[PDB]
Amino acid sequence: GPHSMRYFETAVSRPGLEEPRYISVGYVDNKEFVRFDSDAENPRYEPRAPWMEQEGPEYWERETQKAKGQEQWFRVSLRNLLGYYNQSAGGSHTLQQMSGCDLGSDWRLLRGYLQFAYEGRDYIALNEDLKTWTAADMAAQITRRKWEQSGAAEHYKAYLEGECVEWLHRYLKNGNATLLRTDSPKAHVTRCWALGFYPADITLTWQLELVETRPAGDGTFQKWASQNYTCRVYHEGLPEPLTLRWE
């Protein structure tokens, strides 16, 4: 089926400290592979999946150094925004970023993402044409015009269409261990439970009160909902939907 990569980056400013806390978290087909964290001991892009270990110290200097840039970028930006909105001093603010790319089952580029939130509110976003911006509010217009009258979009486009695809095409080839080999739900009634599935997309029914899908810590997911009445399970990995009652 289809495939994706995403980096989630958060910077949080703090009263007193002149450097914000910074976390970046990498995801492949919706599953974590790399992470950086500013607070930590002495900080770098630790791997959070075993298949990423075959990348050699060399790849980590590259990425770890990249994360150094982003802190710089997020600090300055944190302070540009304070003025844009007349936020006075001593108060806690948050800037968030999302970027990455979708691939379809043929491995070609479906679409890129590059977007931003301030205080948890949409701020500015790259349109699906990788070439123009949607700005949420009047502050974001400043950013927009800076980014127009400076060609950022193409830079991101170049990362999105090229690099993003190239490396994901590769991570895929490096770790089908807990990726391409998807597993599927074991259901039962005690309310029917689906357990053990991957990916997390699933639907449940009763035929004659939704629990949200939830990590079980080991990489699989679970859901539930509560003779006539019978439960059906729908999933990416079922070679035919499941039907049951018992008890």
Binding site: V76, L81, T143, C164
Partner: peptide, 9 residues
């Protein structure tokens, strides 16, 4: 592989 930002907001 993460992306690098250029121009600030």
């Amino acid at each position: 592989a993460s992306a690098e930002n250029m121009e600030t907001m």
